């Protein structure tokens, strides 16, 4: 729902993100929130505003809540659940020697659950990666910035060959046909799992986007992380089938994950 900025407070600067500055603050006094000021000229505003009403009704424990927005001024404000420990990529890098494999698999259960809820709502992320997931004060991981890429005006961020396109998370059908589906989000989730168990290493770090696209197209797959068991690796590898329909759904994926968690006792 719309929020009167009168009911907001700006308390701290968190930095400028992909879509503009973000600040920590309090909503209605008792709610820790993160307020994003939408970079001007970056978004299809009218379309984005109308779609925001759809993305507001999405609720799930492992999905960064949207509490509301302020659109009756510019820049649009986005009021979201405050994730004190920030992006999963940076949480992973700062705490490399703190994670036991049980917490890593947990982080995968969190993400997989959020993506299974998005699967059940027929809502695609289109840019699933570790850089778009956030962590709250209890170490829980939650997905964010879902569906945002549908409204970026910069064509580098959108085209298959754009200099800013996340090639390293894209499925072959996204690179070759721009056919976005839940299966491409599954491929991306596989890459994300690899990020998690790699503790935030860049997938195909020493490959240009073109080199990555071509290697993937001819069968190359990420190496088993040092901290990944052969069963976890089997799961993220099953996410990377050439045939999209050959990839397991997030529900089947969550089940396999939970089987591994049970077997790690
Ligand atoms: N929610 C946060 N909690 C804590 N930290 C945060 C955020 C955000 C953030 C704000 C709005 C936002 O919009 C959304 C769009 C679609 C769905 C959900 C949200 C997405 C993310 N940035 N940051 C930090 C990360 C590190 C660098 N500085 C900024």
UniProtKB/Swiss-Prot annotation:
Modified residues (Phosphoserine): 210, 229, 265
Catalytic residues (UniProt): 127 (proton acceptor)
Motif (CAV1-binding): 187-194
Localization in the cell: Cytoplasm; Cell membrane; Nucleus; Membrane raft
Domain Protein kinase: from-to ranges: 8-261
Superkingdom of origin: Eukaryota
Modified residues (Phosphotyrosine): 157, 223
Post-translational modification, as annotated: Following B-cell receptor (BCR) engagement, translocates to the plasma membrane where it gets phosphorylated at Tyr-157 by LYN and SYK.
Effect of a null allele: Prevents BCR-induced activation of NF-kappa-B.
Binding site for ATP: 14-22, 36
Family of this protein: Belongs to the protein kinase superfamily. Tyr protein kinase family. TEC subfamily.
Disease: Defects in Btk are the cause of murine X-linked immunodeficiency (XID).
Function: Non-receptor tyrosine kinase indispensable for B lymphocyte development, differentiation and signaling. Binding of antigen to the B-cell antigen receptor (BCR) triggers signaling that ultimately leads to B-cell activation. After BCR engagement and activation at the plasma membrane, phosphorylates PLCG2 at several sites, igniting the downstream signaling pathway through calcium mobilization, followed by activation of the protein kinase C (PKC) family members. PLCG2 phosphorylation is performed in close cooperation with the adapter protein B-cell linker protein BLNK.
Assembly and binders: Part of a complex composed of EEIG1, TNFRSF11A/RANK, PLCG2, GAB2, TEC and BTK; complex formation increases in the presence of TNFSF11/RANKL. Binds GTF2I through the PH domain. Interacts with SH3BP5 via the SH3 domain. Interacts with IBTK via its PH domain. Interacts with ARID3A, CAV1, FASLG, PIN1, TLR8 and TLR9. Interacts with MPL/TPOR.
Entry note about domains: The PH domain mediates the binding to inositol polyphosphate and phosphoinositides, leading to its targeting to the plasma membrane. It is extended in the BTK kinase family by a region designated the TH (Tec homology) domain, which consists of about 80 residues preceding the SH3 domain.
Name of this chain's protein: Tyrosine-protein kinase BTK
Organism annotation: Mus musculus
């Amino acid at each position: 729902m719309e929020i009167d900025p009168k009911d907001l407070t700006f308390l701290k600067e968190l930095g400028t993100g992909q879509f503009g500055v973000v600040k920590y603050g309090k909503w209605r006094g008792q709610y820790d929130v993160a307020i994003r000021m939408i970079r001007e000229g970056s978004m299809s505003e009218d379309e984005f505003i109308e779609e925001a009403k759809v993305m507001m009704n999405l609720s799930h424990e492992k999905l960064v809540q949207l509490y509301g927005v302020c659109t009756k001024q510019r820049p649009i404000f986005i009021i979201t659940e405050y994730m004190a420990n920030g992006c999963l990529l940076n949480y992973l890098r700062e705490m490399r020697h703190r994670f036991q494999t049980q917490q890593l698999l947990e982080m995968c259960k969190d993400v997989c659950e959020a993506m299974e809820y998005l699967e059940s709502k027929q809502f695609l992320h289109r840019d699933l990666a570790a850089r778009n997931c956030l962590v709250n004060d209890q170490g829980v991981v939650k997905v964010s910035d879902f569906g945002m890429t549908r409204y970026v005006l910069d064509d580098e961020y959108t085209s298959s060959t754009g200099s800013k396109f996340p090639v390293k998370w894209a499925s072959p059908e996204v690179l070759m046909y721009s056919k976005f589906s839940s299966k491409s989000d599954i491929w991306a989730f596989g890459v994300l799992m690899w990020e998690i168990y790699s503790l935030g290493k860049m997938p195909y770090e020493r490959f240009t986007n073109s080199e990555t696209a071509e290697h993937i197209a001819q069968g190359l797959r990420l190496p088993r992380p040092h901290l990944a068991s052969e069963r976890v690796y089997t799961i993220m590898y099953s996410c990377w089938h050439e045939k999209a329909d050959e990839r397991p759904s997030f529900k089947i994926l969550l089940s396999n994950i939970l089987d591994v968690m049970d077997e790690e006792s």
